[PDB]
Write an enzyme that holds these catalytic residues in place. Structure first.
Site, PDB file in Angstrom:
ATOM      1  N   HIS A  68      44.587  32.964  75.762  1.00 23.06           N
ATOM      2  CA  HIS A  68      44.528  31.493  75.510  1.00 23.06           C
ATOM      3  C   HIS A  68      44.518  31.214  74.014  1.00 23.06           C
ATOM      4  O   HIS A  68      43.616  30.530  73.508  1.00 23.06           O
ATOM      5  CB  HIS A  68      43.374  30.855  76.258  1.00 23.06           C
ATOM      6  CG  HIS A  68      43.645  30.722  77.713  1.00 23.06           C
ATOM      7  ND1 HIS A  68      43.095  31.581  78.633  1.00 23.06           N
ATOM      8  CD2 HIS A  68      44.418  29.855  78.409  1.00 23.06           C
ATOM      9  CE1 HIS A  68      43.507  31.238  79.847  1.00 23.06           C
ATOM     10  NE2 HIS A  68      44.307  30.176  79.742  1.00 23.06           N
ATOM     11  N   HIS A  72      50.227  31.417  73.108  1.00 21.58           N
ATOM     12  CA  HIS A  72      50.296  30.725  74.419  1.00 21.58           C
ATOM     13  C   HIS A  72      50.758  29.282  74.195  1.00 21.58           C
ATOM     14  O   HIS A  72      51.666  28.812  74.919  1.00 21.58           O
ATOM     15  CB  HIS A  72      48.949  30.797  75.155  1.00 21.58           C
ATOM     16  CG  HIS A  72      48.901  30.004  76.420  1.00 21.58           C
ATOM     17  ND1 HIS A  72      49.637  30.337  77.515  1.00 21.58           N
ATOM     18  CD2 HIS A  72      48.229  28.882  76.754  1.00 21.58           C
ATOM     19  CE1 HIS A  72      49.413  29.461  78.490  1.00 21.58           C
ATOM     20  NE2 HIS A  72      48.572  28.548  78.042  1.00 21.58           N
ATOM     21  N   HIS A 106      47.467  21.925  74.486  1.00 22.15           N
ATOM     22  CA  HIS A 106      46.922  21.866  75.865  1.00 22.15           C
ATOM     23  C   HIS A 106      45.701  22.780  76.003  1.00 22.15           C
ATOM     24  O   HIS A 106      44.937  22.558  76.927  1.00 22.15           O
ATOM     25  CB  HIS A 106      48.010  22.125  76.925  1.00 22.15           C
ATOM     26  CG  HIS A 106      48.267  23.562  77.205  1.00 22.15           C
ATOM     27  ND1 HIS A 106      49.052  24.337  76.390  1.00 22.15           N
ATOM     28  CD2 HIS A 106      47.815  24.373  78.186  1.00 22.15           C
ATOM     29  CE1 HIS A 106      49.057  25.579  76.859  1.00 22.15           C
ATOM     30  NE2 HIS A 106      48.332  25.623  77.970  1.00 22.15           N
ATOM     31  N   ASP A 107      45.515  23.769  75.137  1.00 20.85           N
ATOM     32  CA  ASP A 107      44.437  24.786  75.313  1.00 20.85           C
ATOM     33  C   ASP A 107      43.580  24.871  74.039  1.00 20.85           C
ATOM     34  O   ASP A 107      42.846  25.848  73.889  1.00 20.85           O
ATOM     35  CB  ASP A 107      45.020  26.123  75.753  1.00 20.85           C
ATOM     36  CG  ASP A 107      45.092  26.356  77.262  1.00 20.85           C
ATOM     37  OD1 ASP A 107      44.237  25.811  77.997  1.00 20.85           O
ATOM     38  OD2 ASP A 107      45.974  27.143  77.697  1.00 20.85           O
ATOM     39  N   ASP A 217      52.891  25.852  81.766  1.00 17.97           N
ATOM     40  CA  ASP A 217      51.637  26.605  81.571  1.00 17.97           C
ATOM     41  C   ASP A 217      51.745  27.981  82.203  1.00 17.97           C
ATOM     42  O   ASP A 217      51.098  28.893  81.679  1.00 17.97           O
ATOM     43  CB  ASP A 217      50.431  25.877  82.127  1.00 17.97           C
ATOM     44  CG  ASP A 217      49.147  26.366  81.491  1.00 17.97           C
ATOM     45  OD1 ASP A 217      49.222  27.056  80.450  1.00 17.97           O
ATOM     46  OD2 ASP A 217      48.089  26.013  82.010  1.00 17.97           O
ATOM     47  N   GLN A 269      48.230  39.662  92.280  1.00 19.31           N
ATOM     48  CA  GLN A 269      49.437  39.037  91.674  1.00 19.31           C
ATOM     49  C   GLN A 269      50.384  38.523  92.772  1.00 19.31           C
ATOM     50  O   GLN A 269      50.954  37.406  92.588  1.00 19.31           O
ATOM     51  CB  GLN A 269      50.126  40.005  90.704  1.00 19.31           C
ATOM     52  CG  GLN A 269      49.442  40.085  89.343  1.00 19.31           C
ATOM     53  CD  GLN A 269      49.541  38.760  88.621  1.00 19.31           C
ATOM     54  OE1 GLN A 269      50.624  38.309  88.258  1.00 19.31           O
ATOM     55  NE2 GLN A 269      48.420  38.079  88.474  1.00 19.31           N
TER      56      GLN A 269
HETATM   57  C1  JNL Z   1      39.877  28.524  95.116  1.00 16.58           C
HETATM   58  O1  JNL Z   1      40.173  29.088  93.840  1.00 16.58           O
HETATM   59  C2  JNL Z   1      41.507  29.316  93.440  1.00 16.58           C
HETATM   60  C3  JNL Z   1      42.621  29.188  94.299  1.00 16.58           C
HETATM   61  C4  JNL Z   1      43.893  29.450  93.776  1.00 16.58           C
HETATM   62  C5  JNL Z   1      44.095  29.826  92.438  1.00 16.58           C
HETATM   63  C6  JNL Z   1      43.002  29.955  91.547  1.00 16.58           C
HETATM   64  N1  JNL Z   1      43.197  30.346  90.187  1.00 16.58           N
HETATM   65  C7  JNL Z   1      43.866  31.565  89.826  1.00 16.58           C
HETATM   66  O2  JNL Z   1      44.077  32.426  90.690  1.00 16.58           O
HETATM   67  N2  JNL Z   1      44.287  31.835  88.485  1.00 16.58           N
HETATM   68  C8  JNL Z   1      45.294  32.772  88.088  1.00 16.58           C
HETATM   69  C9  JNL Z   1      45.422  34.098  88.625  1.00 16.58           C
HETATM   70  C10 JNL Z   1      46.389  34.987  88.244  1.00 16.58           C
HETATM   71  C11 JNL Z   1      47.326  34.614  87.259  1.00 16.58           C
HETATM   72  N3  JNL Z   1      48.314  35.497  86.874  1.00 16.58           N
HETATM   73  C12 JNL Z   1      49.182  35.061  85.960  1.00 16.58           C
HETATM   74  C13 JNL Z   1      50.267  35.980  85.527  1.00 16.58           C
HETATM   75  C14 JNL Z   1      49.104  33.687  85.403  1.00 16.58           C
HETATM   76  C15 JNL Z   1      50.077  33.184  84.399  1.00 16.58           C
HETATM   77  N4  JNL Z   1      48.156  32.836  85.775  1.00 16.58           N
HETATM   78  C16 JNL Z   1      47.240  33.287  86.706  1.00 16.58           C
HETATM   79  C17 JNL Z   1      46.221  32.383  87.125  1.00 16.58           C
HETATM   80  C18 JNL Z   1      41.695  29.702  92.071  1.00 16.58           C
HETATM   81 MG    MG Z   2      44.197  25.460  79.965  1.00 15.54          MG
HETATM   82 ZN    ZN Z   3      47.468  27.115  79.119  1.00 17.78          ZN
END
Ligand code: JNL
Ligand code: MG
Ligand code: ZN
Length: 313
Positions: A68, A72, A106-107, A217, A269
């Site tokens: 972050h 980014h 944004h961050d 994002d 993933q």
């Molecule tokens: C209920 O709670 C929930 C439900 C669904 C998603 C989430 N949040 C969640 O999984 N965040 C992630 C994870 C892996 C990631 N892998 C990559 C490469 C990128 C760019 N962003 C990611 C963001 C939380």
């Molecule tokens: Mg953010």
């Molecule tokens: Zn971001």
């Protein structure tokens, strides 16, 4: 104001493509950003003295965290540039101005922790902002920088145009809260599939801009496999750090954030491509057809993660 930024030939060509990586030379990222504004917006949109001073104050208030970070910010701004350039006539002068600045900002002042860890830590920002905690902070930090002597890049807008742009930037930044993306994409899904989607309806544009912000994002999943894979290490370095800090508060964190459970990353993933990334770029491609190359690249990277699991790499 007859000073254009130019890039070397290879960048000049690849920067127009969605899968462009901005490279490891930190000191070229401001010129890359200005180049994108000048081409997306005009060479007149911003006073270059002020834009350059805004950019360097924005750089300074991003921290030295694995993901972050300032890289980014510029990476997310480039995805938005590619979307806007491939959708020339669908966006107002103000929207192009606003969204590139929203992506860069944004961050702002991110520390590498989710809204959830701020809540369980009982961080002061969790008391000031009960939902979209970091995102409300990022918008706060944006307005603060805009009000420094010599930093107000919108000075030459009328009172109401200035109100419209700060409102575009507020919603754009809030929308980068992934908790809000699910309902936003669900509504956009139904609106496009019952035919009610209407880009002259402001509350619709809002939703569609919010999906673009999620798309920009998450744009690391839309790069060539070697960039996607190397960015995943940085993303997981933050996740495991937060996991460590959860364990210090006395809570077993989700496996995604537990560095003892690295073996589980490929399956985690798949969940994220299938639950978040592919739905995101699918709905975006339906609404904005010329953004299809983001969906295709995301599908190629899903395939690459399936191959990781199958032991083929
Ligand atoms: C209920 O709670 C929930 C439900 C669904 C998603 C989430 N949040 C969640 O999984 N965040 C992630 C994870 C892996 C990631 N892998 C990559 C490469 C990128 C760019 N962003 C990611 C963001 C939380
Ligand atoms: Mg953010
Ligand atoms: Zn971001």
């Amino acid at each position: 104001g007859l000073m254009q930024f130019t890039l070397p030939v290879r960048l000049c060509k690849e920067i127009e493509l969605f899968h462009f990586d901005i490279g490891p030379f930190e000191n070229m990222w401001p010129g890359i950003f200005v180049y994108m504004v000048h081409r997306s917006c005009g060479t007149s949109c911003f006073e270059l003295e002020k834009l350059c001073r805004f950019i360097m104050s924005v750089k300074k208030n991003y921290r030295r965290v694995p993901y972050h970070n300032w890289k980014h910010a510029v990476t997310v701004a480039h995805c938005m540039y590619a979307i806007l350039q491939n959708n020339h006539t669908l966006f107002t002068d103000l929207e192009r101005k606003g969204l590139l600045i929203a992506c860069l900002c944004h961050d702002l002042d991110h520390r590498g922790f989710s809204n959830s860890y701020l809540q369980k830590f009982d961080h002061p920002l969790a008391a000031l902002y009960s939902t979209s905690t970091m995102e409300q902070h990022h918008f706060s930090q944006t307005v603060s920088i805009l009000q420094l002597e010599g930093h107000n890049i919108f000075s030459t807008l009328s009172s109401s145009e200035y109100e419209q742009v700060l409102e575009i930037i507020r919603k754009a930044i809030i929308a980068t809260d992934l908790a809000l993306y699910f309902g936003n994409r669900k509504q956009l899904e139904e609106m496009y599939q019952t035919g009610s989607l209407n880009l002259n309806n402001q509350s619709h544009r809002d939703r569609v801009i919010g999906l673009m912000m999620t798309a920009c994002d998450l744009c690391s999943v839309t790069k060539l496999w070697p960039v996607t894979k190397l960015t995943a290490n940085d993303i997981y370095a933050e996740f495991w750090a937060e996991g460590d800090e959860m364990k210090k508060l006395g809570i077993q964190p989700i496996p995604m954030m537990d560095r003892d459970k690295k073996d589980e990353v490929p399956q985690g993933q798949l969940g994220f491509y299938n639950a978040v990334a592919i739905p995101c770029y699918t709905t975006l491609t339906q609404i904005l057809p010329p953004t299809e190359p983001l969906l295709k690249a995301c599908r190629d990277n899903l395939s690459q993660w399936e191959k990781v699991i199958r032991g083929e790499e």
